Amino acid sequence: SVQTAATSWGTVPSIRVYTANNGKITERCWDGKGWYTGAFNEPGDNVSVTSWLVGSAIHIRVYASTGTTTTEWCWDGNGWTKGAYTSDQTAATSWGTVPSIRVYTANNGKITERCWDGKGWYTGAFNEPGDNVSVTSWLVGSAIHIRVYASTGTTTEWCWDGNGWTKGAYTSSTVPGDQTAATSWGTVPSIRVYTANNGKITERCWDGKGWYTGAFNEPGDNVSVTSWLVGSAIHIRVYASTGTTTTEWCWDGNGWTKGAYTAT
């Protein structure tokens, strides 16, 4: 299967899905006005994405990986520029507006972190075993809360609450080498952790009071996910991948419906 990562922003919204097929990562945009190919094209077998907003514009970071080489590609409004990231399988997330970017790298079963406080990159304290990694985070107004999902060749949530990593209460039924995705929203928060286990992606949910299996159930060997808020209404977009097929599935508070993105 192809490998996919996605990001969204704004209440329109605008969604960016980056699909790595045979060493060439390709973009597919959605400005609320149709799916159209984007100006992003770089070499890569793996890609993870994150984005924030500064002012009325967007800033996208896209982390392409080949072997053990991870080159960052920036969109500060002005073209796709090479980044200053040095360090395969990766997962990125941001917060604030400086911003602050963590990029967890599940190179060779040991997940390692690279942090950006705005003043250069520096290796972070995170060092946990696992083949696949996903990440999500959220702000409470002062404290950042990161949830890192490590899957040994069993998925183990790791929790940073502004003070030391601690093992999380995530429970799910996985298969060897399973592939995971995650998104979050709200202050509670609400977490949706999707895992790909031999062509059948499942959902595990946490509204703040006990994990529980979600309603989502579709076919796929890879999952990416993103969400956004229209009011207190959350809209999630999950991208399942099999071969080159990539079917978009949409939650809009009203059951799981198919999505406008082509299978491709």
Side-chain angles (χ1 to χ4, degrees):
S1 61
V2 298
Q3 191 270 325
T4 53
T7 177
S8 70
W9 68 87
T11 48
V12 180
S14 295
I15 310 170
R16 295 296 188 269
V17 185
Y18 302 76
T19 301
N21 194 11
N22 307 352
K24 291 210 187 300
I25 297 167
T26 58
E27 184 175 54
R28 286 280 289 170
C29 297
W30 170 271
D31 293 345
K33 297 188 183 293
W35 283 94
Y36 65 99
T37 311
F40 186 92
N41 193 2
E42 294 289 354
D45 303 291
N46 188 358
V47 60
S48 74
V49 69
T50 183
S51 87
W52 61 97
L53 286 77
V54 174
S56 59
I58 183 61
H59 301 266
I60 304 169
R61 295 301 177 264
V62 171
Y63 295 86
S65 280
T66 54
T68 55
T69 313
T70 296
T71 294
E72 176 177 46
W73 291 109
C74 298
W75 177 270
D76 302 293
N78 183 317
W80 279 110
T81 72
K82 183 171 176 167
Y85 181 80
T86 58
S87 65
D88 196 0
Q89 195 271 329
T90 66
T93 197
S94 74
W95 73 91
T97 55
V98 178
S100 312
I101 300 162
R102 300 307 192 250
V103 180
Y104 303 85
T105 304
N107 184 328
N108 189 15
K110 282 201 196 313
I111 297 171
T112 57
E113 176 182 45
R114 288 290 281 178
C115 315
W116 168 274
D117 289 10
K119 307 284 211 318
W121 288 97
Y122 66 94
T123 300
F126 195 86
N127 265 261
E128 306 286 348
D131 276 300
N132 189 358
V133 64
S134 64
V135 56
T136 185
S137 85
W138 63 86
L139 289 175
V140 170
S142 173
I144 184 65
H145 305 249
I146 302 167
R147 294 285 170 282
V148 174
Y149 297 98
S151 300
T152 63
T154 305
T155 289
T156 292
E157 165 177 294
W158 291 101
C159 308
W160 175 277
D161 304 319
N163 197 348
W165 293 94
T166 56
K167 186 175 283 184
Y170 183 74
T171 58
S172 82
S173 297
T174 79
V175 306
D178 54 325
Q179 190 268 328
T180 52
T183 197
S184 66
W185 73 99
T187 58
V188 192
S190 281
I191 300 173
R192 299 305 184 257
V193 173
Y194 310 88
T195 304
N197 291 293
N198 285 340
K200 290 170 208 183
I201 297 163
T202 46
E203 175 184 49
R204 284 283 290 168
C205 300
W206 167 275
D207 302 348
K209 187 172 285 294
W211 285 94
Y212 62 88
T213 291
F216 182 93
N217 213 332
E218 289 298 350
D221 315 305
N222 182 357
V223 55
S224 65
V225 60
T226 193
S227 77
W228 69 97
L229 274 174
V230 182
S232 64
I234 180 59
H235 303 272
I236 309 162
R237 291 297 185 264
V238 168
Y239 301 90
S241 298
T242 296
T244 73
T245 301
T246 293
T247 290
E248 168 182 52
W249 296 106
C250 304
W251 176 270
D252 305 277
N254 199 78
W256 283 106
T257 65
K258 204 170 200 284
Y261 184 45
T262 63
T264 301

